Amino acid sequence: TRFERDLLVELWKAGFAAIRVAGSGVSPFPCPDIVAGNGRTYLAIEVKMRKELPLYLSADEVEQLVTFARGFGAEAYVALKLPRKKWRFFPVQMLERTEKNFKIDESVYPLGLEIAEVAGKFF
Amino acid sequence: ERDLLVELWKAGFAAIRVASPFPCPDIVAGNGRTYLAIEVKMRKELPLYLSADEVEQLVTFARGFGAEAYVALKLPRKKWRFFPVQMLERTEKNFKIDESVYPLGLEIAEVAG
Ligand SMILES: [Cl-]
Ligand SMILES: [Cl-]
């Protein structure tokens, strides 16, 4: 949750108004960790910090994120922070489907976007 | 405010409560077409007073996010009512929803469509 706050700062710096979601996992409704918007692009973000790859994500967590994004009208992203690395943003298409769940390993991580690119995608 | 979340989802909005250095509303909602940034108030009776800072912060967030800024007000025995900021009565240094403003309030159905 310390890390969710750091990402908020980076999002605001990149031109997004962003909020952390109160009780993401503690609620009945699909929930991301952060929701952000800049008037054109809207983001539903699951926020993860790991000491090393790979990041594993359950099918359920990704399904929930995608369902929320569809209902809200936002793009679904996983934001992953590793030590000594800037935040990297993975559209859900970029997640590897494997063993009935999802993963970001060494073959996927380098393709993750920096926050500036997420904004520019619209154009 | 959790009752409000349920009302928003029932009306077809995906809505979250907001958990600070930056401007932020109480609830943000969207249905793909309309996005809402909502300050949530529950009161026993009118008027409701809102500070200029609170309304300014709500409008700034709404402008930055790409949402419509609303105050949602719940009174006992009444359905939730939604007020765009331009509905608010401007007093000397504050904003207000009194008996004359309250009738203008939208119900959730109208906000969506
Ligand atoms: Cl984490
Ligand atoms: Cl990097």
Curated annotation (Swiss-Prot), chain B:
<dbReference type="Pfam" id="PF01870">
    <property type="entry name" value="Hjc"/>
</dbReference>
<comment type="function">
    <text>A structure-specific endonuclease that resolves Holliday junction (HJ) intermediates during genetic recombination. Cleaves 4-way DNA junctions introducing paired nicks in opposing strands, leaving a 5'-terminal phosphate and a 3'-terminal hydroxyl group that are subsequently ligated to produce recombinant products.</text>
</comment>
<comment type="subunit">
    <text>Homodimer.</text>
</comment>
<dbReference type="InterPro" id="IPR011335">
    <property type="entry name" value="Restrct_endonuc-II-like"/>
</dbReference>
<dbReference type="GO" id="GO:0000287">
    <property type="term" value="F:magnesium ion binding"/>
</dbReference>
<keyword id="KW-0234">DNA repair</keyword>
<feature type="binding site">
    <location>
        <position position="39"/>
    </location>
    <ligand>
        <name>Mg(2+)</name>
    </ligand>
</feature>
<protein>
    <recommendedName>
        <fullName>Crossover junction endodeoxyribonuclease Hjc</fullName>
        <ecNumber>3.1.21.10</ecNumber>
    </recommendedName>
</protein>
<dbReference type="InterPro" id="IPR014428">
    <property type="entry name" value="Hjc_arc"/>
</dbReference>
<dbReference type="InterPro" id="IPR011856">
    <property type="entry name" value="tRNA_endonuc-like_dom_sf"/>
</dbReference>
<keyword id="KW-0378">Hydrolase</keyword>
<keyword id="KW-0238">DNA-binding</keyword>
<keyword id="KW-0227">DNA damage</keyword>
<keyword id="KW-0460">Magnesium</keyword>
<keyword id="KW-0540">Nuclease</keyword>
<dbReference type="GO" id="GO:0006281">
    <property type="term" value="P:DNA repair"/>
</dbReference>
<dbReference type="GO" id="GO:0003677">
    <property type="term" value="F:DNA binding"/>
</dbReference>
<keyword id="KW-0479">Metal-binding</keyword>
<keyword id="KW-0255">Endonuclease</keyword>
<dbReference type="InterPro" id="IPR002732">
    <property type="entry name" value="Hjc"/>
</dbReference>
<feature type="binding site">
    <location>
        <position position="26"/>
    </location>
    <ligand>
        <name>Mg(2+)</name>
    </ligand>
</feature>
<comment type="similarity">
    <text>Belongs to the Holliday junction resolvase Hjc family.</text>
</comment>
<feature type="binding site">
    <location>
        <position position="1"/>
    </location>
    <ligand>
        <name>Mg(2+)</name>
    </ligand>
</feature>
<keyword id="KW-0233">DNA recombination</keyword>
<dbReference type="GO" id="GO:0008821">
    <property type="term" value="F:crossover junction DNA endonuclease activity"/>
</dbReference>
<dbReference type="GO" id="GO:0006310">
    <property type="term" value="P:DNA recombination"/>
</dbReference>
<feature type="site" description="Transition state stabilizer">
    <location>
        <position position="41"/>
    </location>
</feature>
